[PDB]
C-alpha cells in the first residue's frame, strides 16, 4: 500500500498546504469514488483543515486505487495553472 | 473567499464573502439565495451563535468554513 502509506506519512503537509477542498470533493464525486453522503460529511466539518482531514480519512479507507487517483488529482491540479502564477499575483 | 452554509433541509449552499463582511451581509446573501428574513436567521459556527454586529474576521471564520443556519420566530 505505497499510496495509502504515502497519504498517512505526509498527512500534516497536506492539511497545511491544501487551500481548496471544493475542487477535490467535486472531482471525487464525478468519478464515483465519493458518494453524495461522503461529500456532505466532509462539508459538515467546521474548519477547512478539518475538511482536509476528513477527505484524507475517507480516501485512505476506500482503498489503494482511490488513493492513487487522489495523488494524480492533486498533481494535475497544481501543475495545471502554475505558470500563470507570476502574472496573476502581479495584478491584484 | 468562499464559505459554506448548511441549511438543514439537507443541502449546503456555497457563498462568496470577505473576512470584512459583517454577519448581516452574510444573512443578506442568504436571503438572496434562500428567501429568508435576516431577523429570522441565526448563524451557527462550531456551536456558537454569531451576533449581528461583529464580522467574519472577528470570529476567525476563514476560507472554506462551514456555518449552520437555524430559524427563530
Author numbering:
A (entry chain A): 17 to 108
B (entry chain C): 1 to 73
Give sentences from the paper.
NOD1 is an innate immune receptor that recognizes γ-D-glutamyl-meso-diaminopimelic acid (iE-DAP), a dipeptide present in peptidoglycan of bacteria, and activates inflammation and autophagy in response to bacterial infection. NOD1 is composed of three domains: an N-terminal Caspase Recruitment Domain (CARD), a central nucleotide-binding oligomerization domain and a C-terminal ligand-binding domain. The N-terminal CARD of NOD1 has been shown to coordinate interactions with its various effectors. Recently, however, Ub has been found to bind the CARDs of the innate immune receptors NOD1, NOD2, RIG-1 and MDA5 and regulate their activity.
Here we report the crystal structure of a complex of NOD1 CARD and Ub. As observed in two previous crystal structures, NOD1 CARD formed a homodimer that involved swapping of the sixth helix of each subunit. Additionally, the Ub dimer in our structure demonstrates the chelation of a multivalent anion by the sidechains of Arg42 and Arg72 in a fashion also observed for Lys48 linked poly-Ub. In our structure, NOD1 binds a different surface encompassing about 500 Å2 that is centered on Phe4. The Ub interface on NOD1 CARD is localized primarily to an apical region of the molecule where the second, third and fourth helices converge. The interaction is anchored in large part by the α1/α2 loop region and the fourth helix of NOD1 CARD, with the sidechains of Asn36, Thr37 and Gln64 hydrogen bonding with the sidechain of Glu64 from Ub. First, Glu56 of NOD1 CARD is involved in a salt bridge with Lys6 of Ub, which is the only salt bridge found at the NOD1 CARD:Ub interface. Subsequent refinement of the model with a dimethyl-As moiety on Cys59 resulted in a good fit with the observed electron density, and we found no evidence that either of the other two cysteine sidechains (Cys39 or Cys61) were similarly modified.
